[PDB]
Amino acid sequence: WRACTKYLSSAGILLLSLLVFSQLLKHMVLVAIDYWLAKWTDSLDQSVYAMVFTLLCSLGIVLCLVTSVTVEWTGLKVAKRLHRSLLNRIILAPMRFFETTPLGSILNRFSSDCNTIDQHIPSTLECLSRSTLLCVSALTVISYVTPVFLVALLPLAVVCYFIQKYFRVASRDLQQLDDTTQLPLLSHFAETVEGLTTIRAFRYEARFQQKLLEYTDSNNIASLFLTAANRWLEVRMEYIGACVVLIAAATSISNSLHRELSAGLVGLGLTYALMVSNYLNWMVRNLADMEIQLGAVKRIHALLKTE
Amino acid sequence: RRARFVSKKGNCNVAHKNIREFLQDVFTTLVDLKWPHTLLIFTMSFLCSWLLFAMVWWLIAFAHGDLAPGEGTNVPCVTSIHSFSSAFLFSIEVQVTIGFGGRMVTEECPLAILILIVQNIVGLMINAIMLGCIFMKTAQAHRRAETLIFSKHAVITLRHGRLCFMLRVGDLRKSMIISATIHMQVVRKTTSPEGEVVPLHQVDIPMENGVGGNGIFLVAPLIIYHVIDSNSPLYDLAPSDLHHHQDLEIIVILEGVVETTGITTQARTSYLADEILWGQRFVPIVAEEDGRYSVDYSKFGNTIKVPTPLCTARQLDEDRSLL
Amino acid sequence: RRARFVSKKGNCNVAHKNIREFLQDVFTTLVDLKWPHTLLIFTMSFLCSWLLFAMVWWLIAFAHGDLAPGEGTNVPCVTSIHSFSSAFLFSIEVQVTIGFGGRMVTEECPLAILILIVQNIVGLMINAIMLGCIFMKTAQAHRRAETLIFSKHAVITLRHGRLCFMLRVGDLRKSMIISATIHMQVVRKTTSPEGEVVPLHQVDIPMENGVGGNGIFLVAPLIIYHVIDSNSPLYDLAPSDLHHHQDLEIIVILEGVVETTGITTQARTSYLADEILWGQRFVPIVAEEDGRYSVDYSKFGNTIKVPTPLCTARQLDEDRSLL
Amino acid sequence: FVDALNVVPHVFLLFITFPILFIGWGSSTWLHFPGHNLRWILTFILLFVLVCEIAEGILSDGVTESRHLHLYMPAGMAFMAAITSVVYYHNIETSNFPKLLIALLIYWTLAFITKTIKFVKFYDHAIGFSQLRFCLTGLLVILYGMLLLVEVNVIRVRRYIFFKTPREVKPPEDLQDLNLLSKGTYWWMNAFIKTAHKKPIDLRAIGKLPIAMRALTNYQRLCVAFDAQRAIWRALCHAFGRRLILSSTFRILADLLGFAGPLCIFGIVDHNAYVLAVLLFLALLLQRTFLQASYYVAIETGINLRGAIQTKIYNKIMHLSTSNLSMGEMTAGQICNLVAIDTNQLMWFFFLCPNLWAMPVQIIVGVILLYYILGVSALIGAAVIILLAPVQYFVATKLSQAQRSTLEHSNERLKQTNEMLRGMKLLKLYAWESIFCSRVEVTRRKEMTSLRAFAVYTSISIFMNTAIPIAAVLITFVGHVSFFKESDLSPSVAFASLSLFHILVTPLFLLSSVVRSTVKALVSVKKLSEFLSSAEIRE
């Protein structure tokens, strides 16, 4: 959580807040009046439906620019800030850590967190954006769709967050295992390259090829567990998704048309409900990937703190 | 197929032909039987007695003049009784103590109060004996678990420069087996120097513990471990003689009482000569793992080849003589 | 946390991973279980059978034409029967032998007399097996009292110039424990000179009484008392080696039958190496007091420091060699 | 005579009756008994049947006077029963020892057939309303009974012929990691994910993959079937093709009912409400699960594929002639990046490859499946939905040169950093610590340029994405308002167009990635066969 307090401190970040929100409401309202003005016509009004089309259009274009330009502006900004600042304050220094920490204390961030900051980080922050956009978006959309959807929420949503909760340790676990298993392969291939005369000459091939098959297996079980866990995440949280579409969308059947007579709710509620369940998936993978990105910068916090 | 004494799973296969006699007794045998004969045999018994008292009340009712239906000038010996089924159902009513109450008996017919009391008493008798014995059944049966187990095959070695003959035991339940000893016999063809031949003369091999001793302590698996020494009657046999021709199935007996039952029981196996083999050894079974001890029986009998002297234990008693 | 074989209170903690197999049997297991599963399991059973015969009489009553209520041109197969509850309550009436008597069956419907007799028989069966087994339950359970107890920790000394290794046992009831012996084992890592390693090879230490002997006589507490001698396999270990690194948990087994039950049972403990300590000694436990003997267990394991030779029992076998 | 309908309940209710006692009273070697997975699927569809029956009941009960009818429950009891039936199958087979339990199951399966017969005399009226689902259960339950017959037809459980239990041993499981329906939804990883957090995971906790997953036998069959046969694709996909196609067709059954959302949206969009609701629930479940397990099939096949690809890599590399080191370092860095890069390329392409096969079949069915053929508000907006293809793929057309551009810049920035950073006491004593910025910022200059602009060309693309859907529907929707069918606006077509817009929207972008995967895959084939033709050492 320190990098939000630290890295994301690289800019005026609240300036990126509201505009992104100027996206979210834009979408939600865009549906709501399409949920009303259209469905209310279903219940010169065609031109009112054109009005909703207008506000939806310009809202989507305003959200459109503000989103992307906000993103690239944020990333570039933090980049020119960070690389300059860190590298500069680091360069001039005594020799203690310069002789203490064998070059793995410097080459890491610029290699990893810099180009992977541009690469990963920028598209990531956007993923958290559209992510929680879908989160709260469904929360209030369905929250409207039922006079009480918290009856549908409390144990469902809560225990959901519990599942994902124990799931993050899986993220760091597995992906840690992959990042582990990557190195020895390129250690081996290159090795046989260097000794290309050596091993063939020395009649050791067997012990070696066996060493190959080893690293193969360890690598590929690492991956198999990785994707394994992932698709576990999707399967479950999606499944409880089917729970929320069932409970909510079904519970519509009565209070809405049977009691309120409401026809102006299920029409939106079904759509946003199911697409919300599927999107919840993207939400989880987004939060995890956001953490996996934060790892690098929180590791650059060390040389940030450096003398 | 040559010689069989007890089985791989260990049942004694040897039978007995025409002893001078079936083991005259009553309820010792039923319990030792299998389920179908005990269950069937009892429900058939109830049907017997039930039938009987059924018909007796049929008759006494009948010949008493009240069974042929009429109006007035009578009191029933049992109320509303009519034909075969009527009496049947009412007797069966009294045995297991139903008592619908619709049918009824009065005090009018003295032989009836008689026949009633005698029925109830003997019926309570069959109840008693039945429940008691089947109690004794679920005590122990042919399903008595031989949880102790033993190897597909066995070997020897020289431990501490001295030849030794193994076996493995085992436990199919997590529960406790306690007060567990071992007695083990050898069967082979035997003749006197004075020329009196016997079919087999059981002779002992002691299981070598500390302080002699009959038994060892089983929760964790532990190997069984003993002597071949020229004083011990098993010292003679040759490696390449026994594994083909020489007749041995070594029999082994363990006798204990499963912790919760409070009754003794046992389990059994032997080893065919061609089965008992030379110069191999048992893999380590158990290993220390995780935060505990760890045991894998998938290896239970797994085996290795060991560089151990190939010679005849009579020539390792000639080695024990020479070196 | 390093090595665990059995517990301080003495349960065997070692488990078994995937033997080649659950221990196929029927009623051996239920009794070994705990109360909730046995009680619950039976009342659930009654509910099963009860449900069944309920519905069977529901049907046979129904399809017999008498269940749909009418007037005349009929005789009931069971009196006043109507809907689900009616049959339910009447079947349950017959099983445990209630018989309100308000409801009633006649002889009219032959399949009904059939279904009745078959119900009563099998129901008496479940009655039997149930009562018998739970009998066997209150025989012994997981609550079987380990009245025998044993020290928080143990020590050694030299009695009569000869090193010795104690333990204390104990009794949590005033009642009689009789026919009580002792068998005690040692677990340590062990390897052959011929190089075959085993996880642990149980080897004996005899409890030194008079005339050898397996057991001692417990009503009053009495110390357990034995040998460390270079012939006895436990002679080697060093005082300052074992108390830290050297791996020992000495296991001790006592096997007896509590006087009134007439069934065997046991109790267990080991001692962790770091637990078993050197050169201390047990306080006098008992004392002669008032008009009687007097025993205070508040001191049960209390301990003193004794000026006894600090050396390695291998160098008291080198002392046993030198002096 | 309704004694028939209720007379169906007796058998099933009894089947639970004995079972609950047995399993309850029961209160670790996994295995697979007879045909299993077949009986698993048959069981699943069966549960679907039984739950559907509650719909017919839920229809009949409302119309009838004096509250709910007696007949409505009988189905209920059944659908409760069969559920547990599978469960006793679970605690039996998984516990092996199929002596009595299998028998009992044979009993229940039998006593069904009488109830089915009761439907057979109920046969007098052929409409099908309840009849179709009912006799449908006739065929179903019966075929299941034949399945248990097959259970006699492999292991031969029963006392017949004293064959006992031939061919009895467990699959080769000793170290292993640490059933079908539970397995599909990933129930097996629960211990791994809890004991996972027990203490953070270590290489000791993970252990060798199984034999059939073992890289050895992988390269084994790969190499024989390959040797049983230049351009290898024929050979590779003709080696793993079984699992490949197996992935494919299941993926298309998952995808095709991906439409499940839309049609249900139309149905409840009408106002038979509740029935349509629940059916939609089960629908969603089946769809989601199937799709995910599809992803499993894909990536999995991937793990095997790439894994053996390595075996071929070094396996040919060493056994080849060394004189090609005349090529040397180029084969070092490049041919290394063949395994490292070109491998991950390859297995990625194979992984998404069934999505390539089926992807169009979903698409075209996507546009066409949209209700609203008569009015031209469909192929227009949806023709935008297709019109986003060159948007993405062209966004690649500007993406690549950006990526390899940042690659060329990164060589300079990284190289200069690694060069200036080492001896910094030597460059400090030389007293510069100044023109490093000329060594950096000037390096950063281009690195700030080529980078910056790229991100712009990068982010703009994503923006168009968020622009396309909101504009596509609305305008299209609004278009209908002006264009044709002006008389009535219907909610059905509306929210329907929403959902189909979402699902159909997914595969377009997916393909837009897929093309790059097919291309890089091809080049991988090229350099791969190139490694094949390399100089061989005489043995």
Side-chain angles (χ1 to χ4, degrees), chain B residues 154-157 159-163 165-169:
Chain B
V155 306
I156 58 94
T157 306
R159 289 178 174 85
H160 307 167
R162 297 190 299 280
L163 300 179
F165 168 88
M166 54 150 273
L167 292 183
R168 181 67 210 96
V169 296

Side-chain angles (χ1 to χ4, degrees), chain D residues 193 196-197 200-201 205-208 210 212 215-222 224-226 228-241 244-262 267 273 277 283 293 298 302 307-308 328 332-333 340 354 358 360 366 375 378 381-383 389-390 396 402 423 431:
Chain D
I193 212 68
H197 175 59
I201 60 101
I206 302 97
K208 60 182 177 181
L216 180 67
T217 186
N218 192 342
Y219 168 77
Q220 184 62 63
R221 176 173 284 274
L222 184 148
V224 57
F226 177 79
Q229 296 301 321
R230 55 181 178 273
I232 49 94
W233 292 0
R234 184 186 296 174
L236 180 65
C237 291
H238 190 63
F240 295 163
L244 293 175
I245 188 66
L246 184 145
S247 61
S248 180
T249 187
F250 188 84
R251 294 190 57 177
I252 196 62
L253 68 81
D255 294 340
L256 180 61
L257 273 71
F259 282 159

Side-chain angles (χ1 to χ4, degrees), chain A residues 38 50 60 170 190 208 212-213 216 220-225 227-229 231-232 234-236 238-239 242 245-246 249-250 253 257 263 267, chain D residues 184-188 190 192-193 197 201 206-208 215-216 273 277 293 307 332 455 467 491:
Chain A
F208 174 79
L212 297 173
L213 276 63
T216 66
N220 296 279
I221 181 167
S223 178
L224 191 147
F225 278 160
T227 57
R231 312 295 176 261
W232 191 84
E234 179 184 3
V235 168
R236 187 156 296 96
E238 184 172 3
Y239 170 81
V245 62
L246 192 154
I253 190 173
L257 67 81
Chain D
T185 307
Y186 291 49
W187 242 79
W188 72 258
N190 285 312
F192 192 78
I193 212 68
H197 175 59
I201 60 101
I206 302 97
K208 60 182 177 181
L216 180 67

Side-chain angles (χ1 to χ4, degrees), chain A residues 32 38 50 60 75 79 93-94 102 104 122 138 147 152 155 157 170 184 190 195 201 204 206-210 212-216 218-264 267 269 273 288 295-296 302:
Chain A
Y204 290 93
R207 181 66 173 161
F208 174 79
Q209 61 171 13
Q210 206 69 60
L212 297 173
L213 276 63
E214 182 70 12
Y215 293 105
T216 66
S218 180
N219 178 37
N220 296 279
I221 181 167
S223 178
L224 191 147
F225 278 160
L226 175 70
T227 57
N230 278 336
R231 312 295 176 261
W232 191 84
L233 292 171
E234 179 184 3
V235 168
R236 187 156 296 96
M237 189 167 177
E238 184 172 3
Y239 170 81
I240 185 175
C243 293
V244 63
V245 62
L246 192 154
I247 298 170
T251 49
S252 65
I253 190 173
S254 176
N255 192 341
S256 62
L257 67 81
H258 174 65
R259 178 180 180 173
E260 184 67 15
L261 70 78
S262 173

